[PDB]
Amino acid sequence: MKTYDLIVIGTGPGGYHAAIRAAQLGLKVLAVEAGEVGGVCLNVGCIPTKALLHAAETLHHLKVAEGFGLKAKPELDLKKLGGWRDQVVKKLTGGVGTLLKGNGVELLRGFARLVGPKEVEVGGERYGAKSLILATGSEPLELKGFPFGEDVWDSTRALKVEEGLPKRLLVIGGGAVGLELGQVYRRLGAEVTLIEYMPEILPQGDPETAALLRRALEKEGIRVRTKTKAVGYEKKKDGLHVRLEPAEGGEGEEVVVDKVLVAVGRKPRTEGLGLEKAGVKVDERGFIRVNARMETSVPGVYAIGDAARPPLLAHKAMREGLIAAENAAGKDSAFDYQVPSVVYTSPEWAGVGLTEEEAKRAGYKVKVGKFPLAASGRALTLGGAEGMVKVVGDEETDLLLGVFIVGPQAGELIAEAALALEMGATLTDLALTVHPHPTLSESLMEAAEAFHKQAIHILN
Amino acid sequence: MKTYDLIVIGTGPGGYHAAIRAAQLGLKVLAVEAGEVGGVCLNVGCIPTKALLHAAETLHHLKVAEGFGLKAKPELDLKKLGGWRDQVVKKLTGGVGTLLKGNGVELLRGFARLVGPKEVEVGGERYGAKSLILATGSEPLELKGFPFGEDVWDSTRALKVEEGLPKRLLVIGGGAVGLELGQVYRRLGAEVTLIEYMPEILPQGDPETAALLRRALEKEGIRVRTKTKAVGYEKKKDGLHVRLEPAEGGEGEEVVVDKVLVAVGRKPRTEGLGLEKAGVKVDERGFIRVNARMETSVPGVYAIGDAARPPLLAHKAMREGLIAAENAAGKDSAFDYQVPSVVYTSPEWAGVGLTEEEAKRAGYKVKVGKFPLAASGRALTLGGAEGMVKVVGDEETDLLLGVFIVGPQAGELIAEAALALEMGATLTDLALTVHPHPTLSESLMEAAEAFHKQAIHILN
Amino acid sequence: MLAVPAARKLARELGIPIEEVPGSGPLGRVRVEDVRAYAE
Numbered sequence: 001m002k003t004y005d006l007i008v009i010g011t012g013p014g015g016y017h018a019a020i021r022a023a024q025l026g027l028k029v030l031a032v033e034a035g036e037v038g039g040v041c042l043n044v045g046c047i048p049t050k051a052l053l054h055a056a057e058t059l060h061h062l063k064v065a066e067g068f069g070l071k072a073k074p075e076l077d078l079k080k081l082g083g084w085r086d087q088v089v090k091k092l093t094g095g096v097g098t099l100l101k102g103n104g105v106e107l108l109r110g111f112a113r114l115v116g117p118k119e120v121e122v123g124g125e126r127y128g129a130k131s132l133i134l135a136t137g138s139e140p141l142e143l144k145g146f147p148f149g150e151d152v153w154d155s156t157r158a159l160k161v162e163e164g165l166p167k168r169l170l171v172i173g174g175g176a177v178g179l180e181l182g183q184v185y186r187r188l189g190a191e192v193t194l195i196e197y198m199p200e201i202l203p204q205g206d207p208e209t210a211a212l213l214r215r216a217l218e219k220e221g222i223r224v225r226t227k228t229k230a231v232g233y234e235k236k237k238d239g240l241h242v243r244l245e246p247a248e249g250g251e252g253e254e255v256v257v258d259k260v261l262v263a264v265g266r267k268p269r270t271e272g273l274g275l276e277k278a279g280v281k282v283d284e285r286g287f288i289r290v291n292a293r294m295e296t297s298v299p300g301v302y303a304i305g306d307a308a309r310p311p312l313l314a315h316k317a318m319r320e321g322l323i324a325a326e327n328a329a330g331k332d333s334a335f336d337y338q339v340p341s342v343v344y345t346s347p348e349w350a351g352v353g354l355t356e357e358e359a360k361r362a363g364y365k366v367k368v369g370k371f372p373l374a375a376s377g378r379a380l381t382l383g384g385a386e387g388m389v390k391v392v393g394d395e396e397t398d399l400l401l402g403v404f405i406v407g408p409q410a411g412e413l414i415a416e417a418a419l420a421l422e423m424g425a426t427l428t429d430l431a432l433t434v435h436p437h438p439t440l441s442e443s444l445m446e447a448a449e450a451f452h453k454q455a456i457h458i459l460n
Numbered sequence: 461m462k463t464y465d466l467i468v469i470g471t472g473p474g475g476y477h478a479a480i481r482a483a484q485l486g487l488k489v490l491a492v493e494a495g496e497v498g499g500v501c502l503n504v505g506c507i508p509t510k511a512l513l514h515a516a517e518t519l520h521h522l523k524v525a526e527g528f529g530l531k532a533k534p535e536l537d538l539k540k541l542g543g544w545r546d547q548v549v550k551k552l553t554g555g556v557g558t559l560l561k562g563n564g565v566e567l568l569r570g571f572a573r574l575v576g577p578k579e580v581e582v583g584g585e586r587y588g589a590k591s592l593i594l595a596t597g598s599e600p601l602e603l604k605g606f607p608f609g610e611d612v613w614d615s616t617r618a619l620k621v622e623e624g625l626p627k628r629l630l631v632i633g634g635g636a637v638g639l640e641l642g643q644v645y646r647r648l649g650a651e652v653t654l655i656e657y658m659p660e661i662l663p664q665g666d667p668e669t670a671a672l673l674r675r676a677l678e679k680e681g682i683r684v685r686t687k688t689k690a691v692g693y694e695k696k697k698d699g700l701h702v703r704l705e706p707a708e709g710g711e712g713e714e715v716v717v718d719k720v721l722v723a724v725g726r727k728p729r730t731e732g733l734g735l736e737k738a739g740v741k742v743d744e745r746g747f748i749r750v751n752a753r754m755e756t757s758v759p760g761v762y763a764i765g766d767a768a769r770p771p772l773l774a775h776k777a778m779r780e781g782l783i784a785a786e787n788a789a790g791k792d793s794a795f796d797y798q799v800p801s802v803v804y805t806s807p808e809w810a811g812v813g814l815t816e817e818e819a820k821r822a823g824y825k826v827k828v829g830k831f832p833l834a835a836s837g838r839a840l841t842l843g844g845a846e847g848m849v850k851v852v853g854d855e856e857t858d859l860l861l862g863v864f865i866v867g868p869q870a871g872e873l874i875a876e877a878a879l880a881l882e883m884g885a886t887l888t889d890l891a892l893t894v895h896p897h898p899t900l901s902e903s904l905m906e907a908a909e910a911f912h913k914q915a916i917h918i919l920n
Numbered sequence: 921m922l923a924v925p926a927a928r929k930l931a932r933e934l935g936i937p938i939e940e941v942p943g944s945g946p947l948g949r950v951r952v953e954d955v956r957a958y959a960e
């Protein structure tokens with residue numbers, strides 16, 4: 001039985017980060033992967049999705065481009081786009097392989113079962129180690145009445161735009177995945193309706209900026225139905241007749257689509273692993289219970305990323321992987337960081353910290369500052385501005401509490417907000433930082449100024 | 461004689477920020493503008509140049525876009541482009557005007573002249589006030605042997621691409637202006653040669669990242685001649701024969717082009733302002749002498765922006781306007797901020813803080829961290845991953861000293877660096893901040909990790 | 921000396937030389953609180 005200092009189950013963002021960081025710390029590491037190296041993010045999540053969005057955006061912007069003399073008759077070859085998407089994934093997943101090898105990590109292909117705290121079985125063989133890190137990720141959450149099949153897709157199938165664009169698509173789920181894929185399909189020419197059970201899309205994020213995203217999506221012809229649920233459907237000669245009803249119940253309406261995309265959530269892949277028999281506690285939804293050190297109920301066994309707890313984000317899994325490895329290596333690390341969330345639609349949506357409501361519920365004397373992109377010189381030089389930056393803070397201490405952005409490059413601008421939170425910046429600190437002009441980042445500075453009623457580019 | 465609490469001369473970034481901030485503080489303000497409202501940045505600087513760059517980038521990216529199936533036959537109507545450009549400028553300057561009026565600031569069109577430390581002359585009328593803010597800006601610097609004319613253009617003339625593109629262009633100057641306009645012309649079809657006297661372009665910035673931009677520019681066909689200087693030229697039948705020599709002198713050389721753009725710097729507009737009459741002192745370069753409070757040698761008279769001191773940047777001018785206004789208002793503000801600088805080429809270049817050379821010279825034990833965009837997942841989903849991020853820090857204290865970036869969105873990512881510096885961040889704080897994945901901003905986090913030899917996406 | 925902008929701003933408005941205000945972080949970072957603490 002080969003032994004190691006640490007064994008990592010899963011080479012997804014969380015896993016390959018834990019494996020590599022562990023190696024850097026001098027541990028002999030074994031990494032197990034049942035499928036494709038790189039996990040969901042690189043294979044059927046983040047990466048291919050961002051690639052499709054970039055192509056869709058390049059195509060879409062050509063319309064506005066006509067406004068400044070750019071005449072063209074674009075023709076997007078879907079088979080070619082699919083090829084590129086695949087080439088991008090292959091590069092990145094291959095890169096991780098190279099990365100793992102360069103750090104002296106042993107990569108084992110196969111499904112791993114947890115034989116016990118310090119032991120694991122793969123392809124028949126057994127393997128031991130003083131520390132085990134569980135990073136098995138998650139999978140698409142099924143929806144009652146809409147089982148996955150030929151006409152009901154999960155995000156993975158939805159990525160293969162070269163296998164047939166449906167004339168009409170129904171997207172169930174107003175979260176990041178649903179919004180992104182819905183927009184990709186719309187820009188590729190399909191009619192798209194998206195429904196969300198909660199009062200607003202991005203239910204966990206700031207409602208005001210999330211509403212601006214929704215209205216922007218609807219301007220592109222995407223029909224967004226909030227406070228709505230899909231009850232069931234029936235396949236007929238002309239398509240899938242889907243029954244929608246208000247969330248709280250009531251008179252329903254019927255729509256006909258060719259395909260349905262179910263993106264209502266994710267399910268942690270923690271079943272048939274042996275966690276049960278090994279004394280590792282899992283909660284109601286299948287998430288492995290852990291403390292801030294990423295430690296499970298079993299000493300020496302850690303859990304990270306999507307399999308451990310929400311939010312199901314890649315950067316969060318990456319950091320938890322670092323924390324887990326560091327503790328396996330003997331250090332004293334804990335996860336206590338601001339975690340931003342981004343939606344790569346156009347416009348983009350990004351948030352970090354507390355919403356006005358969470359802040360108030362927390363007892364702060366909430367005050368907010370807003371700056372619209374319509375007043376951004378940079379936004380105008382980019383072809384037009386729709387969006388805004390909202391900063392949430394405490395008016396007594398002047399402490400920044402949360403930042404929410406909707407507009408181009410929101411995902412890039414939120415990192416500054418995250419650093420701000422980590423550094424304990426006040427609204428004044430943010431307002432006094434000299435941002436380069438002209439840039440979209442100035443909206444953050446101006447929002448901070450609006451918070452003190454002294455923004456310059458808008459009337460206060 | 462009409463009197464006010466404050467009189468601002470000039471409505472460029474500095475002037476209108478001063479005027480508006482002063483009004484917010486309850487002052488009665490008169491703003492005098494001899495030309496177009498909004499100054500250089502909005503009319504013939506930042507804005508129009510950025511708009512051209514965006515149109516050029518949109519066009520240029522279509523080549524790469526062919527890789528993912530986007531086929532198009534792009535034709536760029538230069539008259540329309542010029543039209544959109546004018547529209548953007550008009551929209552923004554109208555915006556400033558609306559802002560000044562909405563703040564209760566009186567706008568007077570004309571050329572102001574100082575008659576006393578508290579009085580000004582405009583067209584013949586007399587206007588006085590307790591405080592005066594001088595925001596007259598700068599103008600193109602003329603190069604010996606290349607006097608401006610029909611064939612020798614300044615940045616303002618270069619902006620008018622609708623008036624016909626020369627087949628061959630020579631740009632003199634490797635600063636932000638020359639690099640940007642040179643790349644715009646190249647992307648619109650012109651052959652371009654840029655000459656820089658110093659060893660590398662952007663002599664004030666990090667030579668490592670600057671060299672990466674130069675190389676990317678050469679890859680597009682732009683001939684960059686460093687350590688070279690243009691001595692003169694003579695107009696002949698086939699064009700302009702310009703003489704080139706090494707920076708120090710020697711073997712002459714000749715290049716033939718249709719037009720020459722001189723972008724070697726700016727000259728502060730401080731003459732015929734009636735200064736040398738109110739007592740206000742100016743240095744040899746023509747800049748109005750001021751302290752950290754933006755106060756000139758005459759109490760009550762302030763000077764800001766390009767007319768006060770380098771660097772000749774917009775965000776700098778804006779903040780100085782705020783400082784000057786707050787002080788005219790009886791407060792006590794001073795400029796002590798980190799000023800970033802950006803070049804909007806593709807790839808973009810941005811920097812803030814100390815270069816390796818400046819830090820070593822100041823006595824810090826310098827250590828650097830680097831992250832290449834070739835290792836960036838986000839950069840790949842965007843097509844080409846050209847660029848890098850370099851952080852400069854103190855090895856003994858772990859304190860961040862400077863940040864330099866070359867790549868897409870470099871200008872947006874530099875704000876995070878500026879905030880980091882303002883907050884006294886260490887390389888560890890930068891690394892501990894959870895950046896969204898996948899985003900270009902992550903490169904900054906990984907650069908911080910590389911500085912500690914523990915980056916994950918590259919071998920340490 | 922390392923002082924966040926908010927602290928430097930408040931130090932001035934109080935007529936207090938910022939380099940004279942003791943910090944609080946693991947190693948001297950001056951915060952608005954510190955400037956006020958020194959003010960009293």
Ligand SMILES: Cc1cc2nc3c(=O)[nH]c(=O)nc-3n(C[C@H](O)[C@H](O)[C@H](O)COP(=O)(O)OP(=O)(O)OC[C@H]3O[C@@H](n4cnc5c(N)ncnc54)[C@H](O)[C@@H]3O)c2cc1C
Binds near residue numbers: 041
């Ligand atoms: C369409 C889509 C788009 C997304 N976009 C974003 C985005 O833009 N930004 C973002 O932050 N997040 C995004 N996410 C979420 C992100 O992909 C996840 O948060 C991230 O992949 C979680 O990493 P992980 O390492 O925990 O797990 P995963 O990446 O899922 O990887 C777990 C790995 O373990 C392997 N494995 C599982 N069980 C076993 C076993 N028993 N033995 C051996 N190997 C095993 C799996 O095959 C897999 O490779 C997206 C998700 C989807 C579906």
Ligand SMILES: Cc1cc2nc3c(=O)[nH]c(=O)nc-3n(C[C@H](O)[C@H](O)[C@H](O)COP(=O)(O)OP(=O)(O)OC[C@H]3O[C@@H](n4cnc5c(N)ncnc54)[C@H](O)[C@@H]3O)c2cc1C
Binds near residue numbers: 498571615772
């Ligand atoms: C081509 C180009 C591109 C640039 N790009 C950028 C960029 O991307 N980012 C950046 O940060 N900077 C850029 N700059 C520099 C930036 O434009 C300047 O730093 C900024 O405009 C300076 O603002 P200011 O208020 O000091 O002066 P100015 O904008 O010059 O404004 C001075 C104003 O005062 C008026 N005036 C002058 N004298 C008088 C008088 N006696 N009476 C009444 N009115 C008067 C002028 O008409 C003018 O409107 C660029 C410059 C150029 C030339």
